[PDB]
């Protein structure tokens with residue numbers, strides 16, 4: 001039953017249970033299973049920093065650019081939650097560096113919001129749009145300024 | 158890393174913990190390895206009314222457990238969130254509809270869409286038990 005297997009894959013991926021994930025996949029669970037709002041196992045592993053699980057999901061055909069009903073991508077979550085190694089692997093596997101969520105935020109905005117210097121540097125190197133504006137017209141730069149992180153602002157200009 | 162994401166003061170937090178007693182606890186679980194479990198026990202032990210929310214259980218720590226916040230019949234003042242950052246932000250709107258005064262994001266649960274949807278007061282990257290210990294403890 002696909003719904004049962006999908007729910008367990010979602011949970012094991014979120015929990016970082018590397019072994020259970022492989023078992024469930026060997027048993028038919030779909031790497032592209034979605035919950036009610038459109039979250040996938042890759043969203044949750046990315047959000048929670050489960051690096052090995054991120055890699056195995058991708059190797060098994062997970063959509064690196066899946067978006068939930070609010071336009072949230074695995075790259076958005078990895079960037080906000082400050083998971084550098086996951087950000088690099090996602091980008092390497094084709095993640096859209098300039099995806100916009102419901103609020104008009106790109107991964108660069110989200111990196112700026114939680115003040116991740118290393119992640120901002122990586123996104124920029126990968127063609128992040130420094131001029132992108134969110135729903136209220138603000139760039140990643142604007143955000144770091146409003147938050148007083150002017151060291152981040154300086155590389156975001 | 159337990160640095161608050163919100164800009165609230167100690168007095169704001171003190172008011173929240175003392176003014177409000179009715180807490181919907183989202184992601185409540187019987188598992189000892191879920192912090193939702195140890196926190197819910199601590200809140201019950203310190204005079205709070207806790208209504209567990211988790212569609213995967215009918216009961217948690219001896220209290221009826223509801224599938225969503227709206228399903229709780231009781232008045233709800235605070236919504237205390239123990240779910241993934243991909244998920245937790247969606248409860249602001251649910252809290253607004255319920256008439257809750259406060260939405261409290263525990264460690265590693267906040268995502269900035271919570272701000273846009275935002276009463277209600279947003280507490281972010283703090284723990285209810287740890288704040289209570291710090292401000293109201295013996």
Ligand SMILES: CC(C)(COP(=O)(O)OP(=O)(O)OC[C@H]1O[C@@H](n2cnc3c(N)ncnc32)[C@H](O)[C@@H]1OP(=O)(O)O)[C@@H](O)C(=O)NCCC(=O)NCCS
Pocket residue numbers: 014015044048183184185186187188191192193196210211212213224239240241242244263264265266283284286287
């Ligand atoms: C959020 C956290 C629980 C991680 O969650 P996760 O591994 O990604 O798993 P999920 O968020 O998807 O689900 C967690 C749980 O709530 C549930 N849940 C999932 N979605 C839910 C929803 N939409 N509504 C209600 N409950 C939900 C689960 O079923 C579950 O418990 P279970 O293990 O008994 O099944 C974890 O990071 C944490 O506990 N954060 C706060 C820590 C804290 O502040 N500790 C300090 C105390 S002083």
Ligand SMILES: CN(CC(=O)O)C(N)=O
Pocket residue numbers: 290
């Ligand atoms: C209050 N406190 C004491 C300690 O840090 O030793 C708890 N609860 O952990």
